[PDB]
Design a protein around this ligand. Sequence first.
Ligand SMILES: Nc1ncnc2c1ncn2[C@@H]1O[C@H](COP(=O)(O)OP(=O)(O)OP(=O)(O)OP(=O)(O)OC[C@H]2O[C@@H](n3cnc4c(N)ncnc43)[C@H](O)[C@@H]2O)[C@@H](O)[C@H]1O
Ligand SMILES: Nc1ncnc2c1ncn2[C@@H]1O[C@H](COP(=O)(O)OP(=O)(O)OP(=O)(O)OP(=O)(O)OC[C@H]2O[C@@H](n3cnc4c(N)ncnc43)[C@H](O)[C@@H]2O)[C@@H](O)[C@H]1O
Lengths: 394, 394
Amino acid sequence: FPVVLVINCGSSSIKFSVLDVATCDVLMAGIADGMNTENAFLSINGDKPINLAHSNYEDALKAIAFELEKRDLTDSVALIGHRIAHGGELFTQSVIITDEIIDNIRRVSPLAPLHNYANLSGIDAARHLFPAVRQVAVFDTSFHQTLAPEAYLYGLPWEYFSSLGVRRYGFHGTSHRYVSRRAYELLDLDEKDSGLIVAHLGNGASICAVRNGQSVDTSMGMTPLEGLMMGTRSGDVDFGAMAWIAKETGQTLSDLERVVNKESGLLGISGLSSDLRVLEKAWHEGHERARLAIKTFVHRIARHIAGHAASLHRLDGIIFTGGIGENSVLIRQLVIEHLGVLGLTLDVEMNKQPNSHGERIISANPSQVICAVIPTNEEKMIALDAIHLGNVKA
Amino acid sequence: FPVVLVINCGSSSIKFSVLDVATCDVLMAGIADGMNTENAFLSINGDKPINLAHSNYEDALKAIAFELEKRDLTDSVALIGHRIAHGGELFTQSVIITDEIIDNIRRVSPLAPLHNYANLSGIDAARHLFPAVRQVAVFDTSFHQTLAPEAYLYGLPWEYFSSLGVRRYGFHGTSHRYVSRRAYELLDLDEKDSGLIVAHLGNGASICAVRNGQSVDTSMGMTPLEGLMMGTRSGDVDFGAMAWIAKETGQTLSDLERVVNKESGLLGISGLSSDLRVLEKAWHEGHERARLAIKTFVHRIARHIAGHAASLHRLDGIIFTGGIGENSVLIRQLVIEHLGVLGLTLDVEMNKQPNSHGERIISANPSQVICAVIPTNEEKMIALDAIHLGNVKA
Ligand SMILES: Nc1ncnc2c1ncn2[C@@H]1O[C@H](COP(=O)(O)OP(=O)(O)OP(=O)(O)OP(=O)(O)OC[C@H]2O[C@@H](n3cnc4c(N)ncnc43)[C@H](O)[C@@H]2O)[C@@H](O)[C@H]1O
Ligand SMILES: Nc1ncnc2c1ncn2[C@@H]1O[C@H](COP(=O)(O)OP(=O)(O)OP(=O)(O)OP(=O)(O)OC[C@H]2O[C@@H](n3cnc4c(N)ncnc43)[C@H](O)[C@@H]2O)[C@@H](O)[C@H]1O
């Protein structure tokens, strides 16, 4: 029974899952947390938060590897999948990791400095601990490389694009890819003659228009700061406003970068929390700013969904996913009601069903566009890419 | 035969028109140009670019007033209309200018520092030269004051809004207002049960959703830099990209403000011109970057039109206006073809008609949404506001 080990090695953590190759079910999951800090620790299945004070990325993954061998999983690891934050223009699909791929991930790493170097740290650690195991890189940008220039260009001088690589990349590509594929089955659509909008609504949030199987528009930019308002991120913000703020308060770009990334969005408007459940309850209890944060959140989602539909010839389906898209009955309803202009009709009993009901249609039959919830599974998508690549003769 | 004198007193110029009260036709127009510079001059009807070296705003307007009295128009000036760039949250409609209005325009002027002080200079000059004449202020922001919080809030911390007044204001309000009113007549729509999108496409460009007569979404922000890509303005740009550029090139916010406002957009992508006619011809002649600039321009327009439709219950009409919207056969067609997802059908023979044909429907009958061109007339709108206010007992 071979397994796939899937790794997402971030700035401050390493999330991992072990998936059975045959069923793509999780056999083990966990997270090394507080990385590059004094108090690091490893918690598997939320079972025994074991301390690992002062540990590098290879130490953390060696710890993880130890827990795998103690459960006799080490000898069944046939593939390792690494989530990579940014593939620039060099990656359009998942690849078997070689010296070339490593060099190329390093070349594009200036586009996502923090996150990509953590991903490379994860690759170096895994290559050390599993050298007879094929390893695969899956990029959060690659699904969006089918965007046309008119959809990826900013209105900046041409030199910023051609010399510096400033353009829209988009993220959540692995989620958008997985969820769109699942939608063709759920909605009984011909992949090659289809228009979908996927709303990945999590702590990070983005929209993607998928025309005939290909990403043709997405809401995040060169960085994850563009598009939808999110848990702590502003989303779209007038650059004139930001420059005006700078002059008025004496803050720098780096100061405002932090504000916009870490103190903004649902947190910033509500003054309470980035957590939608907290804010949903706060509104229920009469909190006005919580209500304003949610309404603002919903408004910007409706606006991007409708806007992204412009890149479709025909809108067949709108698919909600992510922690909010999967679990927020209210947010899904408010968004759909904000899109009556597209002829959407909600079946509220179907919309009320909890996420235990899995892949599910939430629109009424008279709806001009099908609406559905499809739980995302990025680890499964990575594992499937790795399994296909496992057949390759390199 | 009373006339209205209409003034738009900008950073470097004073545009004026004299309109007959009875017909709202222009009797005289002109522009004092190169203001606050060594070589200033006044050109009426493009007839004799008369020099006015080293002249203040009152000198320029005194020059203009001289040309009015030489044509015996001075004694028929019954009303003066002033275009004001920014009314903040204080102005929701056009007003008779009093000491209070002046104080309030000064209060909100920090939101548009350059432009509003030029407008106030224009008011002081006109009040000096015509003290027995009622004068009226018409704000480019006021039409958009019906926007809901969810549509005007940024995802920044609440303090930026409540203490600093950071929010979406939107501009071209006088154009959007005028054109939407004209559309109810042209499209035989009930103002109170209607959904329109107006695309004001000029050197500055913005979209506005008008639901039941009221602006409910608009594409410009706190400043004119948000939304559509324009002649020299970037439009929407990832703040992460801008911060990344700052770190990479060593430029400051003020440097990037200039790039984004003056070197970006159609100019920036094409490397040729901000002028759409130049770029249309350049594309015709095989220029690839001109083609990319136009396609990008069109893509961002389609995306905002569709997105703004989300704030309507029903989309009845899409109205093109401004220098590009009125005259660009190609851009109108490409935008409409990018919106087939909304069920638009173009009547190409009607779309080919030049702007001499005035207020005109350009959609085919099977179109689910009516598309029209309605030439804007901001001076006429200002004059009409002034004429209504001329009946008031102050
Ligand atoms: N600058 C950068 N450049 C490049 N890459 C970068 C980057 N920054 C980060 N990245 C990378 O991008 C990747 C994705 O990051 P994120 O975008 O942050 O991840 P996510 O999809 O939001 O997943 P997460 O688990 O955080 O949220 P969830 O869907 O559970 O959703 C959580 C939400 O769901 C809500 N929720 C859960 N249950 C709910 C319920 N019953 N009702 C309502 N809401 C509910 C919760 O309240 C919460 O609000 C990462 O690999 C990261 O390293
Ligand atoms: N930071 C700030 N804050 C607050 N307020 C501010 C501000 N900056 C500026 N403002 C104010 O905002 C107001 C409006 O400014 P703008 O937004 O710049 O004015 P506009 O509506 O673009 O009018 P303009 O005459 O420049 O362009 P036109 O429609 O002719 O269209 C010209 C275009 O049409 C095109 N065109 C003409 N004929 C064509 C044809 N046949 N085919 C194709 N294109 C054609 C031309 O090529 C050209 O591209 C002003 O009062 C200004 O002071």
